[PDB]
Each structure stands twice: as structure tokens, then as C-alpha cells.
Chain A
Amino acid sequence: RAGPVTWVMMIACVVVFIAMQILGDQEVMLWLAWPFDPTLKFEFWRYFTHALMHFSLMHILFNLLWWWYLGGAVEKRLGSGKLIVITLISALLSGYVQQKFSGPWFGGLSGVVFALMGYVWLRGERDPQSGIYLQRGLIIFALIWIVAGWFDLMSMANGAHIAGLAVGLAMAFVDSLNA
């Protein structure tokens, strides 16, 4: 269960995290983060590149674990283009809601991850024949994870988590009608 998009995303994250270590956070942040200034708004990469930045090794590992587990499943059973689209829609939207929640200084792949969780869960629910599904041990831990960010158990992007979750559920629900 190793598709091209799964691994290309993992490599990107690792490539970006290395650069953050050579140059420091702020330095990469100033270039990849969501536009802080409407003057920068046509720097179109920014709406996606925030997802690549991680600020702790544990975080890049945790996120890439989820991404490889759930991203591999979508790409294996449903195709690479399907994974591309979940990724781009949810990076864009979870970044958008995160910016409104708390402004432009945020990063990480977990908005995309929560949108993969929403997707794989509702898709395997409404649509078993797709061959993907989320275990209830895992949506135990997804549900525990959103709410831990709530209560500040830890400095989480909370717009990001909730925005992606919604994105994933919404897309899985659409897809489980055209199925």
C-alpha cells in the first residue's frame, strides 16, 4: 500500500522539515505560510504550502503515519486523482478556516488528515464496496483528538481540524451517492 501521491506527499513534508531545520521555522514560515498581508494574496502556493510545514519531529511522524495509513487506503482503493483532490480541497479550506480562527501563523498536515478521517469513515460506512473503512478504535482517537485541542491539553490549529473533518465528511457523502 504505497502509491505515488502517498510517497510524494511524505517526501515533500520531510524535504520541507529538513529546510526548516537548516534555516529555522520563521524563515520557512515567511515563505510558505498563508498570506499575512493581502498584498501577498497572489502568492497562490501559500494556500497549500502551509500543510507541509511541521514544527516538531513527533508531529511530522504522527501526521505522516495517519497520512500513509489513511492516504494509502484512498489511493489504493480509489485512485491517485481521488487522493490529490481530497488533499487540495482540504488544505485550501482548513487553511482558510484556520486563518479566520486565529490568523496566518500555523502549519502541518493534520487538516488534510482529519479530512482523510472523515472521508474513509463515512465512505466505508455508506459505501462498504469501496473497500476502505475506519475502525472504531481510530475514530475513538480522532474524536478524542479534536476535543483535546479544544480544551488546550498543546497549541492546536482548531479551525484546521474541524474544517478538514467537515470537508472529508462532505466529500465522502457526495461520493456515496454517485457510487
Chain B
Amino acid sequence: VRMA
């Protein structure tokens, strides 16, 4: 996933 990608972290915001």
C-alpha cells in the first residue's frame, strides 16, 4: 500500500 501507500502511506498518506
Contact = CB atoms under 8 A, between A and B. Distances in A.
A51 B1 CA distance: 13
Contacts of A56: 3
Contacts of A109: 4
Contacts of A110: 3-4
A25 interface: yes
Contacts, number: 42
Interface in A129-179: 155-158, 160-161, 164
Contacts of A51: 4
Interface residues of A, number: 25
Interface stretch (A80-88, A98-106, A116-124): A98-106
Contacts of B3: 54-56, 59, 106-108, 110, 155-157
A110 B4 CA distance: 5
A29 B2 CA distance: 12
A49 interface: no
**Which of B1, B2, B3, B4 is packed against the most chain A CB atoms within 10 Å?**
B4
A157 B4 CA distance: 5
Give the 10 A-B CB pairs with smallest separation, nearest first.
A160-B4, A157-B4, A157-B2, A106-B2, A108-B4, A105-B1, A110-B4, A111-B4, A108-B3, A155-B2
